[model samples]
Target: DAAGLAISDRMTAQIKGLTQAQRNANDGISLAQTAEGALGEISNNLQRIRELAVQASNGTNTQTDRDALQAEVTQLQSEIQRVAEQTSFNGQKLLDGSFNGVQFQIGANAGETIGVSKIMNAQTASLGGSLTRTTSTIDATDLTKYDTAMAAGDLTINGVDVGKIDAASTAQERAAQLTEAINRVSSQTNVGASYDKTTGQVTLTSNAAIAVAGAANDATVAGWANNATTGTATTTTGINSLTVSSFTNAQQTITQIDNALKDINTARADLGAVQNRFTSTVANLQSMTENLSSARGRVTDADFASETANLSRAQILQQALEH
Candidate 1:
């Protein structure tokens, strides 16, 4: 009778934990699936857009035919944006970069979790990291102005600090120094700098947006000026203003759509990995649940030795009562 009553509270706690862990694992899988499914559609739409652009890029296509091809391209482009914005799990946006690293608890205790990585920013403006080659033209015309900016530490690329650069004797030397410094940190800033050597014009470029600030001192200069040159990289990875207006334009748009597809596809692979990881977690929890349940049932039966002794005691008591 005591053995029947001895099913422990600790037993119920493990059962509760296993149940919650399984639930958490399933939710993780669902979220990954939602994100991946939306990305697949986005990739599909981009594929069609690229194909239409290819048709328009053909030299045989007239302006009339190009305009007709652009019709379907525009519709497909909008749908990609729609899917990016509309795809969600439990109202939490997935593709628009709103759902970054979300942690899923897949264990019975605290600190046992798997954090997912960021989804691509697939909004109209920021699709594929908006990876157009952004170029900010720094008019380093006045050599003295460049020297002053270098001394004042006001020359910066993408808000990253620029250390004091050596004063240059000529415009070409100033541009050369700027190019060297900027290229040195290209990996960190994602911005690159190149000098003309002829006009000594310094061009800072990046696949992402670039911000180049000038000297705060002096007019800053007539040609150089003081304000930061901000270059808004147009739809390179984005389809917002993409067009099939002409053969050249259509051919270029094909490249842009390809870039977008590559980015979206990579993100899908990441979500797929997360899905597999959660699947394993679900299986592991299932095993743990089974083991704990079996353990609880076995203890409730007590031991064979204890049951036999209880039976013998009951028989002796019955015999004494009969006598």
Candidate 2:
């Protein structure tokens, strides 16, 4: 009887705390998780927008087709922005502004909130890591020469970065080197540079469909090496745009644009995977929070059922003891 009384008294205290804290903690976790998930979805939407740009930029697509694709891109971009700017959790904007991190308070001391931004598009910023590349123009005559006859020499792709090769290397090697360089620009998988073995021609590609802001130019190949020694490359101070020339057929353009889309899709998928991981983590953490609150309730909250029962039992037991 003494043990049962003690047990019920302790349980009554726990039940009381668990009752409301559980609900509060659950709400907080849900809000935090929603913010995390929404951010990921926004990133995915932006990636989709980027993909549409590739579709529009392809030369095979007529001006009309490009216009249509551009319209779709614009819509997608807006949708992405909408998701980023408007998505919120309990009035807290999740995507647009940089979020410090998720915090939850349970007790007077403080309870931990699950920080799940990594799972989805939940980055500090709405745009996440995506960067927009502007299309630029360059003198066509300069690039056409490479199309005419490419020597093993230094060629700068898009003028963003300069590279060097020995003269002894074949045009194919130089093309490969340049392609390799462009591919290395970002950690995200990108489609870049095509080499036509038959014609000894190389085409540099960009996964970012947005045109380069400048024209491709400034081709004073230095460090002339016809053989296997790496030479020092120095630029002679010339201004050139980074844009490549127009394509003759739509096929090349389409392939490259499609590649850009694929790259973006891949990125979106990657973010999705991260979101999934966070989703599971958030769920488990939420469960833990609930359990913890319940445990705390069990430890101290008033359980009406148990408390009332105990009150009745204790009253009876006290009367009997008095007798």
lDDT values, one for every candidate: 0.69, 0.41
Highest lDDT, which number?
A: 1
- When superposed on Cα atoms, how far off is each prediction in RMSD? 15.3, 14.0
Q: How many residue pairs clash per model? A: 0, 38
Alpha-carbon runs more than 4 Å astray in model 1? 1-7, 131-237, 303-312
**Candidate 1 TM-score over all chains jointly:** 0.63
- TM-scores for all candidates? 0.63, 0.39
lDDT of 2 by residue, 1-323 (tens): 89968966655554444444445556655665565466456546545544554553353543345435545544555665566667777777755544445544332233533333322332223232332322212222223233333332233333333333334234444444443443343123232333333344434333343222122323322211122211222221100111112221122333433443443355446445544544554465456556656765654555666788898999999999999
lDDT of 1 by residue, 1-323 (tens): 66545557656877888889899989999989989988988888888888887886565654457657767777887888888888889979998878877998777778889888888888766665454455556556655554543653556666665556766666556665665555555546666554444355665555655555645434233122344545656434466756664444455567777778888888988999999999998999999999999897787667766888899999999999999
Per-residue error for 137 in candidate 1, Å, reads: 19
RMSD of 2: 14.0
